[PDB]
Design a protein around this ligand. Sequence first.
Ligand code: EQJ
Ligand code: EQJ
Lengths: 368, 368
Amino acid sequence: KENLTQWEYLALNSELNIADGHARQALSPGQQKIVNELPVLWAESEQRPVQQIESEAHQAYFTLLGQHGYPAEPGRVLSCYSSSVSMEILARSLSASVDRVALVHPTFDNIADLLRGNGLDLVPVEEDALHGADLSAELLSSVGCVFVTTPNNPTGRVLAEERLRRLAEQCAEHGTVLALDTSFRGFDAAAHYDHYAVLQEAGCRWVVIEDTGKLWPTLDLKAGLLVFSEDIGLPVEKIYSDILLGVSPLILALIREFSRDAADGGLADLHAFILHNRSVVRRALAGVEGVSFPDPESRSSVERVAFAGRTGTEVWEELQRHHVFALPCRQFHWAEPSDGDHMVRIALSRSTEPLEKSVQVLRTVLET
Amino acid sequence: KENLTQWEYLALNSELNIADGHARQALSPGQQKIVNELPVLWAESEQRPVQQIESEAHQAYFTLLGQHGYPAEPGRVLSCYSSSVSMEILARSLSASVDRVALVHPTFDNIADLLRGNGLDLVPVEEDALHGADLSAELLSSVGCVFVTTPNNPTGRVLAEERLRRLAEQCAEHGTVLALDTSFRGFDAAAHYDHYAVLQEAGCRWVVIEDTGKLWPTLDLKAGLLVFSEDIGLPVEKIYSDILLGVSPLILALIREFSRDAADGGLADLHAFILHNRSVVRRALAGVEGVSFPDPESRSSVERVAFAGRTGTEVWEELQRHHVFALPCRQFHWAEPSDGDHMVRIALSRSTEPLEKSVQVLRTVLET
Ligand SMILES: Cc1ncc(COP(=O)(O)O)c(/C=N/[C@@H](CCCNC(=N)N)C(=O)O)c1O
Ligand SMILES: Cc1ncc(COP(=O)(O)O)c(/C=N/[C@@H](CCCNC(=N)N)C(=O)O)c1O
């Protein structure tokens, strides 16, 4: 009710959960071999310095996704329990010296709520403005930080390299912090150009929150990776250290192993699997008059579906009576929820059969 | 440097780390059997509703430690990545409506730093005042929350049932939130009377932060458990849900299994192990001139050593020269750091060989 996560609680124990964006599909054979070796990874984690495991996990993950220029010095990458924990750290860090943040709209709502809960005033930037033109000098001088989710959740829209470059330059020209949430990076190769090369070359203050969680079905074993420019000028390291000593070496080793499996062909398979599931959904809502797909080009692991004549809340209630749990979209539009009134979001990181069943139910529903 | 956690980073990749209080001893045979069956726990975590696993982990852990009255209704116990995340949620939840918190002094320093970081003013309450007498009406009426760590870290002092009852009654009559951090509960049977029974009977608004992390050597796989009265009147549920959907079911299953091993005899083995390691430290230093132990009755996994004639931080430097990492105590006295510059803290949740190595260095240093 109060936010998207509270809608997601309702799905957590149902077999037709198509709500939260976490990866819940079956493990691949290669991934299952990693799970089978957990006691070997446990022993390794008992015996090696955590710094070496962590360094190996960062190198595997960043290189996997083309981020070759990431700062590999310890500790320029802070490994957090989750990217939301990274976001809480950044948010509270920003509130030490910033009053206002320009934020892409729509986006996942806990980004807005963590920023707002830490006392920051939010200025929405619609995706068209963000991708299509320079930000206004008026905007950039009224905010201390521009925050971009890319690929965006829920739209899948990717900030292209030329636009990231121009944005980083505008932020440098105004001294404003450029912050990126790249949680969905792994799903779309358009997001695999080297973002850190661009940022370092522009010379702006910057933070990037990476996330290993949404990509592989690891039972929510994950890290958020909070990466910050040398001159970030915010107390991210101090506040990080108030919250944690570090993450489990076993999780870091799991990230290392899953990244290597991904580099050896798992990532291509993941892209094919997500594309298959997206087609399942779009074929199932084939003709269905009134139905449309707002993000024709998205390659993300979540999928928006729009409809005329119904609200997403009504669709959600009709769906739930059949034990199918999706997500109304109102709350992604954190500055104007009515923008989301006629959409639901569907999770594609699911085994195809339960997904198929859920969308067949949505098809029936979406025909009164 | 800036807090105790930053002192703890220095030891993290070192063979003679006796600094942080995390459990780093070897798995028992029963515990290693659990680790060997991780692939089975993984399969269980994929197949069963997380809610069932979580309820089972909570029941196992609360009943293990005497807390039979805990609220077992789903949603009343909020499983967090760590008790520090629980603490961040609580601190932010307090910041809207509370200006000042009465906080036991000394205590672990990120408790103070997370409260201060979220805008709360702190009022120290020395242990002897806290345990030995009712709090003044003047203090209680000037403060929105009383926060007590029991068993305390670093002293191991346990809030007795009679005092908890009176303290909860006093907070109820002044409209004050009583908050307990009970992360060290499992080490001291003196803390295994049912805290939830007395909290509910007194009828104050309350929060308890439980923690599984310090008890067992699980490579930091753990949960903080944030528990709250129905009338708590703070946004703990909302801010929780801003931060996370939930913890890994695999970690929940692990907690359940380690709690069951502990109920089968592992807890007694742990108490005997910790007592052994404390005995090692105290026998090693019994005769050194100027050396004392301020907490003779502590059963905690951390041990305070006091010494005349040198600063806890000079002793820290000498031990470092010999590749031994403990902690200076100044920063536990978060309101008056000089109260602790003649003590260090030693970590006991360690294998006995490296602990014995570490304490032999300390004897030698304190003799020269
Ligand atoms: C763009 C973006 N950046 C960070 C995160 C945090 O990921 P985390 O959960 O910390 O691992 C998300 C997660 N979105 C999930 C729901 C997460 C569960 N709810 C909360 N975390 N409050 C979804 O879209 O369903 C994200 O989309
Ligand atoms: C009484 C009490 N309550 C909560 C926590 C948080 O436990 P967590 O680390 O979240 O699992 C602690 C931590 N005790 C350890 C580790 C400090 C690590 N540094 C940070 N956490 N910032 C110690 O005393 O060395 C505690 O003593």
